[PDB]
Amino acid sequence: MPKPINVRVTTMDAELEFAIQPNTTGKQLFDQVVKTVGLREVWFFGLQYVDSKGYSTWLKLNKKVTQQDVKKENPLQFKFRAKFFPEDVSEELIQEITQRLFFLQVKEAILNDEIYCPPETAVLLASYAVQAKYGDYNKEIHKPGYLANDRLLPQRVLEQHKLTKEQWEERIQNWHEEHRGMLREDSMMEYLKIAQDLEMYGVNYFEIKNKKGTELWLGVDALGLNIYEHDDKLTPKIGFPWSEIRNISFNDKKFVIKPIDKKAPDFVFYAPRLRINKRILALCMGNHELYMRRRKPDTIEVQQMKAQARVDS
């Protein structure tokens, strides 16, 4: 019996610590975690970690945890996070856990300015956040200032509008009162439905240059690829539905997307590093994989997760 290797896995609301044996694959580690939290819609997630060089990487299940440059410290830090997003929140997230985990992960991104958000929408989203955290507004329980310790708005709006904390509390609160009677799980889904319609939602961006040296954005996401101008990361200039894509490939830095119709030209671009061109392809394979999967008949496992969820409501 060799020396145990401790690992610290953490979800958006839980912290797990357990030892693994030297030859544990990422797959096995992933499962223990998933079984501990009672998650089943595992296809969206993955274990995130930093390697020696400090590059944030996704743990590979088919390889030993030990032999992936997992930065060395004790315990070994991993972040359980969603790698892929659903095409439709209300139709792919069944278990209430897969829901609060997405709810949390997306709100962190909205909050962190990672997913652009207009001020109206932010306020609105905040209202659904508080209703989920505090329940029904009650003039007795939530007196002036109940929303002072909370982080509710995306900095980019606080900067863009210098209202006071109280001023903001007033706008959010007004909306908090509108959700009188709503259920916790319903407030988070209510949040997600609104979020999922944002332009930068579930999009992975990468700085690229085309044949000339014009700076650009590549947006790998659930439905295909997209090319964005540098100034506008919202609306794409050239889209690429999985449907009209023959194959995608790359060499050192030159990346190429071949159309399924030979009439359309091949889109070419260049990535900074190899490590970043590898990640792009990886995302494609995963998103395209799920894209297909959700067009196939519901598997005889996903099949009744949905029925027990019609009982719990």
């Binding site: 894509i245 194959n247 790359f250 399924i260």
Partner: peptide, 16 residues
């Protein structure tokens, strides 16, 4: 490695 090669993923299979 210390060199560069070609990686390719078919978004359209060979009709297996």
């Amino acid at each position: 490695r210390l060199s560069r090669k070609t990686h390719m993923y078919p978004v359209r299979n060979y009709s297996p």
